[PDB]
């Protein structure tokens, strides 16, 4: 159903779990067939599992961790802080993002939006 | 102007500063004359400095701190994690919120949305 505040926290924590192991298939499956992603927020959105799968294959030798609790509401919405530790062109860098997700009546991610820019990068 | 990613970070950090000291007038003035606030997200919004001033007078013996960096984008948007340490009816409690703000072409807060629920309360 539409996640409860408590379920939203669990789903989002689960999502950082999937990204940490890099299980791309399980991630894509957390989304709705026609979800949209806005990462970074301010760029045109990507729509559909096809495109999102592409989007995720492209990005993951990474580890992600939650750097604070998942803030959840009662309307199927949640936001959360986390760090992405990569290794850019030999040089290891870290990115601090904040994701805001909205789930649907099935518990799948209808829409995701990431807030970050070069001000959050530590290279 | 429309804040740069860097200015958005400074404005938002400033906003937690104001809430910590409880300078209600300076906070209200950070908003646009007709901004709207959604706190907690999922409740009807409050519109206008009049209503927002009311909203803030009502809430502040509190201290607020940032518990992670301000994630900012290039389109006048930003989000940030922070903790509110109160003292409810004799009993001291803490609330972990996540705010998402959007600034206008003057650097004022057009819209604010807070994500939190009783799952983020530690009483």
């Amino acid at each position: 159903n539409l996640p409860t505040a408590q379920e939203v926290q669990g789903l989002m924590a689960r999502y950082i779990e999937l990204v940490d192991v890099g299980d791309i298939e399980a991630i894509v499956q957390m989304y709705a067939d026609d979800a949209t992603v806005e990462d970074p927020f301010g760029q045109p959105p990507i729509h559909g599992r096809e495109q999102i799968a592409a989007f995720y294959r492209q990005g993951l030798k990474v580890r992600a961790c939650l750097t604070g609790p998942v803030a959840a509401s009662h309307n199927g919405c949640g936001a959360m802080p986390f760090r992405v530790e990569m290794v850019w062109n030999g040089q290891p860098c870290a990115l601090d993002v904040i994701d805001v997700m909205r789930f649907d009546e099935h518990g799948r991610i209808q829409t995701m939006q990431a807030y970050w820019s070069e001000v959050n990068l530590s290279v």
Side-chain angles (χ1 to χ4, degrees), chain A residues 2-123:
Chain A
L2 192 77
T4 71
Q6 251 138 267
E7 337 199 81
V8 167
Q9 267 185 148
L11 299 154
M12 287 184 83
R14 198 202 169 224
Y15 171 91
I16 288 315
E17 231 85 289
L18 297 197
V19 181
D20 195 41
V21 292
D23 194 335
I24 294 152
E25 262 142 48
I27 292 180
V28 179
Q29 193 89 50
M30 290 204 55
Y31 280 91
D33 82 89
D34 64 335
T36 64
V37 158
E38 262 152 286
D39 186 336
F41 182 79
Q43 231 84 88
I46 80 206
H47 183 110
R49 293 226 178 124
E50 205 207 351
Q51 289 182 49
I52 292 141
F55 159 74
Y56 278 100
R57 229 141 233 319
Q58 196 98 245
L60 318 76
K61 184 244 121 141
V62 169
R63 84 195 220 75
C65 16
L66 271 186
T67 60
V70 176
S73 71
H74 294 294
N75 64 166
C77 281
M80 81 183 141
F82 71 99
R83 153 158 313 203
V84 174
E85 286 203 325
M86 49 245 306
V87 168
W88 197 15
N89 279 197
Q91 220 153 283
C93 46
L95 177 67
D96 283 299
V97 176
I98 290 241
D99 274 23
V100 164
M101 295 173 141
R102 164 160 240 180
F103 295 90
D104 67 13
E105 44 281 343
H106 295 118
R108 283 195 258 280
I109 309 176
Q110 210 188 76
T111 139
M112 186 280 248
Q113 290 172 311
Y115 290 80
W116 67 275
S117 78
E118 330 76 25
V119 295
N120 297 119
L121 230 143
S122 284
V123 92

